[PDB]
Symmetry: C3
Subunit: 170 residues, 3 copies
């Protein structure tokens, strides 16, 4: 395909951004951290387009692969905010992860409404992954709001996965 090639490139952007942030952190370099933050954002921004772009075209599977990159970028962006001192990036990484969590439920709702259980479960998996990042973003800021929101989002994915299990075992 063609749209997946960007996503595979975007995933390497988040990966190189994660490595750069880890090697720039301990030896107090803010320049590498300025790359890793910018590298992660655009991989999320480009994934945000491809997620929406694949959703409309009629692909809910290609959209999901983009939604995980929001999770992976918001995950890496949380560290850059955490390792540095920017309480401004943690405010953006949550919105990025929360968007993926919100969109996953939609594709889940649509896939379950169409009878595509497998595609639904992949959306439920990204729902749990977004809850994981949001939970992590909340323990080092002590905000029980994000930790509570993550609880229901993770719990909601839990029950829907329980339902798809019985629906298969008939």
């Amino acid at each position: 395909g063609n749209l997946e090639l960007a996503l595979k490139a975007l995933q390497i952007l988040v990966n190189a951004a994660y490595v750069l942030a880890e090697i720039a952190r301990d030896r107090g370099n803010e320049e590498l951290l300025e790359k890793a933050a910018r590298l992660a954002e655009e991989a999320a921004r480009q994934a945000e387009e491809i997620a929406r772009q694949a959703r409309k075209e009629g692909n809910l599977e290609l959209a999901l692969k983009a939604l995980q990159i929001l999770v992976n970028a918001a995950y890496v962006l949380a560290e850059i905010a955490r390792d540095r001192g920017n309480e401004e990036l943690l405010e953006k990484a949550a919105r990025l992860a929360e968007e993926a969590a919100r969109q996953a439920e939609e594709i889940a709702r649509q896939a379950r409404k169409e009878g595509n259980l497998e595609l639904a479960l992949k959306a439920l998996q990204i729902l749990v992954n977004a809850a994981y990042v949001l939970a992590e973003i909340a323990r080092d800021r002590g905000n029980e709001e994000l930790l509570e929101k993550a609880a229901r989002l993770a719990e909601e994915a839990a029950r829907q996965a329980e339902e798809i299990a019985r629906q298969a075992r008939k």
Copy 2:
């Protein structure tokens, strides 16, 4: 599809159990922990039955894919046990890991007797992953450290053996 869809749904139970676990682990709160423990504890029981059901028909993979969920479920169940200090739960999670390694050994031993090379390697991978959890469940009962080491020593011993047979062709 098929009962595989149950397993993929079961894997999400262990994943969601882990996120809840992490949350209540740090942010002091045992109500989530017993929910997440039960969530993780449940998918482990579900995976155990599908393993047996897959063993009988003939499909060893569905059995293997279920055995991996026992390893992944036992991992989350051990984690709550370490933080919550429940030395009894560390045991149930350990027994869960001990079964998957043992059951994989059969599928590993069985696949090698038929000449199905990578069906064995998939069982050997599940054996090494189960040995890994027990090491964590021990890192300090020194016997279990032998049990986890012993399982790790033999999965390695066979993978280099199976790799000698593949490189000649």
Copy 3:
């Protein structure tokens, strides 16, 4: 189908990780020999497949070089062995060095998926190089490892814009 050999070598690297994590200075040396065997054996499968043609099995073999060098990197720390840091580093640079070439070859052929898979080994090798470099405090490798990621992000960033022209 040297692919079946590679998956077996990964179980060698994995069991070496379990044994190295547990510790017995004998076990740490048995895990060291276990991983160092799968890395030198992955190097052979890489060379043979890269020579006959196959650029994926070479990459699939190179990924175990990163993972074998990664597992051996821990044994170096837990045993206090700066001589071991050389082998784990030597493999990581090799996997990184070979990946760039395989990336270069794949880009000339139009196998953009293959380049990105080769570029992933660049980041995975660059991360290990960084990990091996913060342990002894060698800032030469820490810049070298940073550059490896800076190249992988830079080359993959083009493939992201070059591919969306036909989305």
